[PDB]
Amino acid sequence: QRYVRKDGKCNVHHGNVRTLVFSTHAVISMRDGKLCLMFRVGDLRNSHIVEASIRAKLIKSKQTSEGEFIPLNQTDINVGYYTGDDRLFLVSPLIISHEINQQSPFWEISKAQLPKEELEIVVILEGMVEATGMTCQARSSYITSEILWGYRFTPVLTLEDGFYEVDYNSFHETYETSTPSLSAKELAELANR
Amino acid sequence: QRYVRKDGKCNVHHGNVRTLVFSTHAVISMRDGKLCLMFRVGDLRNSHIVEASIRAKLIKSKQTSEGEFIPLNQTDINVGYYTGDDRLFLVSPLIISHEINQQSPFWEISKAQLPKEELEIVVILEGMVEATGMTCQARSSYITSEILWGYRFTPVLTLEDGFYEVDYNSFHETYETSTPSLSAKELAELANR
Amino acid sequence: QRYVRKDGKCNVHHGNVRTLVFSTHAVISMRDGKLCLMFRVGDLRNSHIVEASIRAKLIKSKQTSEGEFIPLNQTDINVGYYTGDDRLFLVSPLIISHEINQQSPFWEISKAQLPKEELEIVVILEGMVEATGMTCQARSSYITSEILWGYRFTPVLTLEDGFYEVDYNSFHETYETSTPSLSAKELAELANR
Amino acid sequence: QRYVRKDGKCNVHHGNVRTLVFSTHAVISMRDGKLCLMFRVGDLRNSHIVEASIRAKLIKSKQTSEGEFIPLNQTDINVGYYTGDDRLFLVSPLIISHEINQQSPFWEISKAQLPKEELEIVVILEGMVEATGMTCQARSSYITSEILWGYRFTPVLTLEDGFYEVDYNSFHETYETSTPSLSAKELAELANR
Ligand SMILES: [Cs+]
Ligand SMILES: [Cs+]
Ligand SMILES: [Cs+]
Ligand SMILES: [Cs+]
Ligand SMILES: [Cs+]
Ligand SMILES: [Cs+]
Ligand SMILES: [Cs+]
Ligand SMILES: [Cs+]
Ligand SMILES: [Mg+2]
């Protein structure tokens, strides 16, 4: 049952005519053995967004080994830059995933360490509005208390009579799932041996 | 016999004035010993497309090793991201090629495995219309039954009286060619020894 | 105390309504044991800049090992191209940092060698103006006498009653800090052993 | 003597107000021991070009090891994609250089082999016009007889009374220079031992 028709029209949202929401929370949990920070990003019901892309910054004041204090310092969280998976094809809500690896700022952050960290994730979508011919930027924010450790996003997408429908009342909904409380670094150590 | 004149005008489509089609099917076959998924993408007879680029997504529901079910999950099929061969110079139909390697989702997919897979390839061209000064997105789709294994695209381009002409009646046409029925992974294994 | 609200509005510049300055000087100094060339770049008080990015060129006449003289030759100074840290989220002044490594043109340049070099750094920001829907380019320049060796930028950002304020009278201000007078290459050599 | 003023205005073309030409020929010759294909690209006297970038394609019909004939097949010639040196700061004519290495299509092409090759280089600049707020594409072409082996571009840039002037009558001019007649591959072989 096709997601996209041969002519490029999408079988989503029966009877559409082709403000953008981010999930209120972010989740952390395992996917294929890798620990992932994930948040959700909705489509615009009534228009495509050409050249869509997602990026995320980490706002976190820091001190260099030489004592320079950098308030609200920015660093770029990896959400598919290298493989071009940041280039979105937004035609229904997507879970964006940041794999927490050796280069990720969350490498050394455990379930317990987490609420003691003072940091904020800024998510930024940017694209051109299909109809409007204009460049949009949509932004949102997550702080330490809004990253739910050990959770996943409820799915929202069902197939009904040859179109795909979105239950937007589940958009922000998440559920709990068995998930180690160790930091990614620790997990790596433990696993390797 | 020049494809492009010193002043930048192209010797294609005698008497042009400078809707975009994708081939109805995709083909898989060997090119220089590498197995390739290929589809074709036409130009617009009557205008250049500045900053053209092609990308492709794989729509395929999946289950993580932790049992999270991701319906119609997206992953980015490599069509020249790294070398900038995705940056198209569209002035006649082009065969876009995805080399099926260790990173490709088709790595483990044989001729027989193929029709049993439930997946869909979304192709998306994007550029600015030379004349119209506006950002376009053109899309199309291939499902398992529309990828012809062991085929190639008929050529369409002939040189006639100092211009190059396109036989658009061959645009979607393909022909059969000797092609192993083994998956790319298998071919690799076999070859290496 | 949030930098960005859940709805994407920023808590910066109480009572704003959402010309761009570069710092007059550049500084060189250690950050986390790496030697860095840094300059500062302000926001526009009264509008966001979508798709912001920074690049920098090195203007420096040179002679090839074959005696070709290239006047005012250009080479690209690395300011976060690879990790996408050049993709700015400009909502207050940012210190842009170029880590002076083996690929950097300053690799072999010491504190003493510096004023004897005849070179110029061109910095170029580019983005779309949130409101104006138009592509802007802002440029500035640093010459040998405008790179202060052994300095850092004064911070400018303070938190006041739930908004963040910018002391623009400190924008261009810098202070001295203990910093080795050896070139990056030399430091590397010395350290490694 | 500044190339760019602190406020971002350029000291080029006294009394300007801020059609684009490519050199008629391309040259091949050594730069710092590496063999380089080079062509020249002028600025627009009377406007900046924001977000400028250069790419080049190789048009060359080919036959795969499986006998598929691909007429006027395209492949992307590397002109600074990886280091972002393709991102031009066009404010006077620039020599664009493609280093002929193991990945370059000219790797195996000698001075003698050259005129027997049937190939064409398409060069494409793209950017937004500073004033006009519009996306431009400028194109040109080089065929085998227009790549002068063993040459260099005459310089065109002189400094006069605090502005830099361009002698546009030298734009297309080139001069001969001692240059080995061996292919890049061959040179590599020879040198390594
Ligand atoms: Cs990238
Ligand atoms: Cs974008
Ligand atoms: Cs890329
Ligand atoms: Cs594009
Ligand atoms: Cs990049
Ligand atoms: Cs940009
Ligand atoms: Cs790139
Ligand atoms: Cs561009
Ligand atoms: Mg653009």
Q: How far is C172 from chain D (nearest CA, A)?
A: 13
Could A72 and C164 be called an inter-chain contact, meaning their C-beta atoms sit closer than 8 Å?
A: yes
CA distances from C91 to A45, B66, C71 (A): 29, 40, 37
Token pair recorded at residue A186: 């620790």
Distance separating alpha carbons of residues B44 and A130, to the nearest angstrom = 19
CA–centroid distance, residue B137 to ligand 8 (Å)? 17
Q: How far is C149 from chain D (nearest CA, A)?
A: 19
Distance separating alpha carbons of residues B114 and B141, to the nearest angstrom = 16
Measuring CA to CA, which residue among B9, B22, B129, B107 is closest to residue B58?
Answer: B107
How open is the CA angle D21-D24-D25, to the nearest 5 degrees? 130
Which of A57, A66, A138 is facing C31, going by the closest CB pair? A66
Chain B residues within 8 A of A36 when measuring between CB atoms = none
Burial B109-130 (b: 16+ CB within 10 A, else e): bbeeebeeeebbbbbbbbbbeb
Could C133 and A138 be called an inter-chain contact, meaning their C-beta atoms sit closer than 8 Å?
A: no
Distance separating alpha carbons of residues A22 and A9, to the nearest angstrom = 24
Please tell me which chains touch A, using 3 or more CB pairs under 8 Å as the contact test: B, C
Could D140 and B8 be called an inter-chain contact, meaning their C-beta atoms sit closer than 8 Å?
A: yes
CA–centroid distance, residue C25 to ligand 9 (Å)? 31
Cross-strand bridge partners of residue B53: B87, B126
- Residue found by looking up tokens 């193929």 in the block: B114
Q: Answer yes or no: are the C-beta atoms of B167 and B158 closer than 8 Å.
A: yes
Cα B78 to its chain centre, rounded Å, is 10
Q: Are strands B49-59 and B120-129 parallel, antiparallel or unpaired?
A: antiparallel
Chain A residues within 8 A of B70 when measuring between CB atoms = 95, 155
Query: Which ligand lies nearest the alpha carbon of C127?
Result: 6
Distance separating alpha carbons of residues D42 and D22, to the nearest angstrom = 6
Which of D69, D74, D76 is facing B155, going by the closest CB pair? D69
Which helix (H) or strand (E) element contains residue D118?
Answer: none
Q: How far is D8 from chain C (nearest CA, A)?
A: 4
Which of B59, B137, B143 is facing A50, going by the closest CB pair? B137
Instruction: For CA atoms A174, A178, A184, A188, give the dihedral sign.
Output: negative
The DSSP 8-state label assigned to residue C191 in this structure reads H
Distance separating alpha carbons of residues A73 and D113, to the nearest angstrom = 56
Q: Answer yes or no: are the C-beta atoms of D156 and D7 closer than 8 Å.
A: no
CA dihedral A9, A15, A20, A26 (to 10 degrees): -90
Side chain identity at B193, as an amino acid letter? R
Query: Which residues have CB under 8 Å from A193's CB, separation 6+?
Result: none
Could B140 and A2 be called an inter-chain contact, meaning their C-beta atoms sit closer than 8 Å?
A: no
Q: Are strands A174-176 and B135-143 parallel, antiparallel or unpaired?
A: unpaired
Cα A102 to its chain centre, rounded Å, is 19
Burial C30-55 (b: 16+ CB within 10 A, else e): bbeeebbbbbbbbbbeeebbbbbbbb
Token pair recorded at residue B131: 């004349």
Could D74 and B94 be called an inter-chain contact, meaning their C-beta atoms sit closer than 8 Å?
A: yes
HEC sequence for chain B: CCCECCCCCECECCCCCCCCCECCCEEEEEECCEEEEEEEECCCCCCCEEEEEEEEEEECCEECCCCCEECCCEEEECCCCCCCCCEECCCCCEEEEEECCCCCCCCCCCCCCHHHCCCEEEEEEEEEECCCCCEEEEEEEEEHHHEEECEEECCCEEEECCEEEECCCCCCCEEECCCCCCCHHHHHHHHCC
The DSSP 8-state label assigned to residue C144 in this structure reads G
Query: Which residues have CB under 8 Å from D61's CB, separation 6+?
Result: D69, D70, D71, D72, D73, D118
List alpha helices for chain D, DSSP H.
Answer: 184-191
Could B157 and D69 be called an inter-chain contact, meaning their C-beta atoms sit closer than 8 Å?
A: no
Q: Answer yes or no: are the C-beta atoms of B124 and B55 closer than 8 Å.
A: yes
- Residue found by looking up tokens 């060796």 in the block: C149
3-state secondary structure of A190: helix
Q: Answer yes or no: are the C-beta atoms of C82 and C88 closer than 8 Å.
A: no
CA–centroid distance, residue D63 to ligand 5 (Å)? 32
Cross-strand bridge partners of residue B151: B176
Cross-strand bridge partners of residue D165: D158
Q: Answer yes or no: are the C-beta atoms of B19 and B46 closer than 8 Å.
A: no
CA atoms within 13 A on the CB side of B157: 21
Experiment type:
X-ray
Instruction: For CA atoms C104, C108, C114, C117, give the dihedral sign.
Output: negative
Distance separating alpha carbons of residues B155 and A42, to the nearest angstrom = 42
Distance separating alpha carbons of residues D190 and D174, to the nearest angstrom = 28
- Residue found by looking up tokens 């964006």 in the block: A96
Which helix (H) or strand (E) element contains residue A28?
Answer: strand A26-31
Distance separating alpha carbons of residues A10 and A159, to the nearest angstrom = 13
Distance separating alpha carbons of residues C182 and C103, to the nearest angstrom = 17
Neighbours of A112 (CB within 10 A): 11
Instruction: For CA atoms B116, B117, B119, B120, give the dihedral sign.
Output: negative
Measuring CA to CA, which residue among A114, A74, A78, A72 is closest to residue A98?
Answer: A78
Distance separating alpha carbons of residues D22 and D15, to the nearest angstrom = 24
CA distances from C191 to A29, C33, C157, C186 (A): 40, 10, 35, 8
Q: Answer yes or no: are the C-beta atoms of D56 and D104 closer than 8 Å.
A: no
Neighbours of C110 (CB within 10 A): 17
Query: Which residues have CB under 8 Å from C136's CB, separation 6+?
Result: C20, C49, C125, C126, C127, C128, C129, D50
Distance separating alpha carbons of residues D1 and D107, to the nearest angstrom = 40
3-state secondary structure of A111: coil
Q: Answer yes or no: are the C-beta atoms of A91 and B122 closer than 8 Å.
A: no
Distinct helix (H) and strand (E) counts, chain C: 1, 15
Distance separating alpha carbons of residues C19 and C1, to the nearest angstrom = 29
Query: Which ligand lies nearest the alpha carbon of A128?
Result: 2
Q: Answer yes or no: are the C-beta atoms of D74 and D59 closer than 8 Å.
A: yes
Distance separating alpha carbons of residues C46 and A115, to the nearest angstrom = 34
Please tell me which chains touch B, using 3 or more CB pairs under 8 Å as the contact test: A, D
Q: Are strands A147-149 and A26-31 parallel, antiparallel or unpaired?
A: parallel
- Nearest residue of chain B to residue D127 (CA atoms): B51
Side chain identity at C19, as an amino acid letter? T
CA distances from B175 to B9, B27, B99, B111, D70 (A): 33, 10, 19, 17, 14
**Between chain C and chain D, how many beta carbons pairs sit less than 8 Å apart?**
76
Q: Answer yes or no: are the C-beta atoms of B35 and B28 closer than 8 Å.
A: yes
Q: Answer yes or no: are the C-beta atoms of A91 and A171 closer than 8 Å.
A: no
Q: Do chains C and A touch (3 or more CB pairs under 8 A)?
A: yes
Structure's resolution in angstroms = 3.0
Distance separating alpha carbons of residues D85 and D105, to the nearest angstrom = 20
List alpha helices for chain C, DSSP H.
Answer: 184-191
Interface of C with A (CB under 8 A): 2-8, 29-33, 48, 50-51, 80, 83-85, 87, 89, 92, 94-95, 128, 130, 133, 152, 155, 157, 164, 177-178
How open is the CA angle D132-D133-D138, to the nearest 5 degrees? 75
Distance separating alpha carbons of residues D53 and D123, to the nearest angstrom = 11
3-state secondary structure of A91: coil
Structural domains of chain A in order of their starting residue, each with its CATH number? 1-193 (2.60.40.1400)
- Residue found by looking up tokens 């053209």 in the block: B52
CA dihedral A50, A172, A75, D127 (to 10 degrees): 10
Cα A159 to its chain centre, rounded Å, is 23
Could C120 and D4 be called an inter-chain contact, meaning their C-beta atoms sit closer than 8 Å?
A: yes
- Nearest residue of chain C to residue A59 (CA atoms): C3
Q: How far is A116 from chain C (nearest CA, A)?
A: 14
Which of B29, B85, B157 is facing D71, going by the closest CB pair? B157
Which of C30, C84, C155 is facing A66, going by the closest CB pair? C30
Distance separating alpha carbons of residues A1 and A165, to the nearest angstrom = 13
Q: How far is B143 from chain A (nearest CA, A)?
A: 8
The DSSP 8-state label assigned to residue A10 in this structure reads B
Chain A residues within 8 A of B74 when measuring between CB atoms = 85, 89, 94
In terms of phi and psi (left: phi > 0; alpha: psi -120 to 50; beta: otherwise), the region of A170 is alpha
CA–centroid distance, residue A81 to ligand 1 (Å)? 5
Q: Answer yes or no: are the C-beta atoms of B124 and B39 closer than 8 Å.
A: no
Phi and psi of D145, rounded to 5°? -85, 0
Q: How far is A89 from chain B (nearest CA, A)?
A: 8
The DSSP 8-state label assigned to residue D104 in this structure reads S
CA distances from D95 to A37, D28, D47, D136, D168 (A): 45, 12, 19, 20, 14
Interface of A with B (CB under 8 A): 2-8, 29-33, 48, 50-51, 80, 83-85, 87, 89, 92, 94-95, 128, 130, 133, 152, 155, 157, 164, 177-178
Neighbours of A12 (CB within 10 A): 19
Measuring CA to CA, which residue among C64, C76, C30 is closest to residue C177?
Answer: C30
CA–centroid distance, residue C136 to ligand 8 (Å)? 13
Q: Give the CA radius of gyration of chain B.
A: 18
Strand order in the sheet with D34-41: D94-99, D34-41, D26-31, D147-149
Which helix (H) or strand (E) element contains residue C8?
Answer: none
- Residue found by looking up tokens 């390739």 in the block: B36
Query: Which ligand lies nearest the alpha carbon of B80?
Result: 3
Q: Answer yes or no: are the C-beta atoms of C32 and A65 closer than 8 Å.
A: yes
Which of A59, A74, A135 is facing C133, going by the closest CB pair? A135
Burial of D70 from C-beta contacts in 10 A (0-12 / 13-18 / 19+): middle
CA distances from A113 to A75, A109, A179 (A): 20, 6, 15
CA–centroid distance, residue B171 to ligand 1 (Å)? 32
CA–centroid distance, residue D69 to ligand 1 (Å)? 32
CA–centroid distance, residue D23 to ligand 5 (Å)? 28
3-state secondary structure of A184: helix
CA distances from C38 to A5, A29, C83, C147, D9 (A): 50, 37, 17, 9, 22
Distance separating alpha carbons of residues C58 and C60, to the nearest angstrom = 6
Distance separating alpha carbons of residues B3 and B7, to the nearest angstrom = 12
Q: Answer yes or no: are the C-beta atoms of B73 and B60 closer than 8 Å.
A: yes
Q: How far is B109 from chain D (nearest CA, A)?
A: 21
Distance separating alpha carbons of residues C12 and A150, to the nearest angstrom = 33
CA distances from C165 to B128, C3, C159, D181 (A): 40, 11, 6, 64
- Nearest residue of chain B to residue A159 (CA atoms): B71
HEC sequence for D56-116: EEEECCEECCCCCEECCCEEEECCCCCCCCCEECCCCCEEEEEECCCCCCCCCCCCCCHHH
List alpha helices for chain A, DSSP H.
Answer: 184-191
